[PDB]
Write a protein that binds this ligand. Sequence first.
Ligand SMILES: C[C@H](NC(=O)C1CC1)c1cccnc1
Length: 182
Amino acid sequence: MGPGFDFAQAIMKKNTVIARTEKGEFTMLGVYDRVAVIPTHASVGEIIYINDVETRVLDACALRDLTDTNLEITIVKLDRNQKFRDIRHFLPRCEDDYNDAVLSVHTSKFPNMYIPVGQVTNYGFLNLGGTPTHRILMYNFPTRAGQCGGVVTTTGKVIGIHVGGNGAQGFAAMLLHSYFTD
Ligand SMILES: C[C@H](NC(=O)C1CC1)c1cccnc1
């Protein structure tokens, strides 16, 4: 509808796949080469389904901060025959607050879904499903089951992936450029 939705659509149309684990179907953001991200609660194993194709997992790492606190981001390297467009230059370098974000989801349950969530707060600490979690972004939208993995964007930046909600607020794990250096 506007330039925020334009940036979101551009990311969804080239840098997302549908990931299926034994814990459900997730929006999965591809970042570069065969490297993608997914919420750690997806419990990625040795095999994952990518757009309904059986795919070997070459590496999976559940990220934690240097205090050994959960970040709720798993970085997955896929045995896929195709690379993602490199979008690392759209990742923030530092923790921040944002205006006017969009949450975008693409699954069997919610295809081509875009939600203007408004202002995004650097919330920090969250007890997420009983797990102490750091680097949480918060937005005041009543997000629902089916939205985990959804991509949070502003104009020009890919800032997070949706990891939970409390019925009134939604919560995303930050994406930082430093997670994807090689
Ligand atoms: C304007 C456009 N932006 C995107 O693709 C956003 C979705 C990432 C673009 C065009 C040419 C080179 N870089 C970027």
